[PDB]
UniProtKB/Swiss-Prot annotation:
Induction: Induced by D-xylose, dependent on the cellulase and xylanase regulator xyr1. Repressed by glucose through negative regulation by the crabon catabolite repressor cre1. The gene is xyn2. Substrate binds at residues 72, 76, 87, 121, 125, 135, 170. Optimum pH is 4.5-5.5. Stable from pH 3.0 to 8.5 at room temperature and from pH 4.0 to 7.5 at 40 degrees Celsius. GO terms for cellular component: extracellular region. Its EC number is 3.2.1.8. Belongs to the glycosyl hydrolase 11 (cellulase G) family. It comes from the Eukaryota. Glycans are attached at residues 37, 60. GO terms for molecular function: endo-1,4-beta-xylanase activity. This is Endo-1,4-beta-xylanase 2. Residues 1-188 form the GH11 domain. Its main location: secreted. The chain holds residues 35 to 223 of 223 of the full protein. It comes from Hypocrea jecorina (strain ATCC 56765 / BCRC 32924 / NRRL 11460 / Rut C-30). GO terms for biological process: xylan catabolic process.
Amino acid sequence: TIQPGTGYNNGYFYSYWNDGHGGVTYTNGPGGQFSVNWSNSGNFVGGKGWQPGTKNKVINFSGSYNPNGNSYLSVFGWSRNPLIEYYIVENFGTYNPSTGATKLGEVTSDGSVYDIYRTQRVNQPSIIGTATFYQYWSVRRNHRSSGSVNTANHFNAWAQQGLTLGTMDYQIVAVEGYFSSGSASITVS
Ligand SMILES: O[C@@H]1[C@@H](O)[C@H](O[C@@H]2CO[C@@H](O[C@@H]3CO[C@@H](O)[C@H](O)[C@H]3O)[C@H](O)[C@H]2O)OC[C@H]1O
């Protein structure tokens, strides 16, 4: 594993965050590759990409994703002013993150329809400290662990529906888990 934090590796930004619970290891590999191994973890997020992201980046990902429990695989990042945590969810484990959320539209992109949602986090950790903030979601109907994501299609559809983003902070392909186990090996470009 590596130490939780951020930085650059082989030309790609990375970010590895966890809640301190234990049970998760994160490793940086050659080029845009990263691996995650977890067993009875807490909450964590790790992956490679860019800092800052952009609003029209085409992001490619390829590899294996084997969750056992609650986990997501997504194009993931933040904006500032307004503070937003966003997800383009390509696959997940036992929990669809939009469960119970209100559907705010549809967008077709990169071989699937996606459903659009907004949720809210109350007094949770963020890139600026503990805060209350909205989250934006595009959830892919046809799950996959390789593909291409045209981020502009998502950001434009969100804006059309009233979900506007601020200035872009980091933007990565992320594996997230919440009290689960699994393994993953993903290459970004
Ligand atoms: O020490 C600071 C870190 O906490 C910070 O990193 C961010 C911490 O919050 C993470 O957010 C969670 C992502 O997963 C969701 O399910 C949770 O609800 C969020 O709270 C965020 O992804 C990390 O980047 O960075 C700055 C450090 O000073």
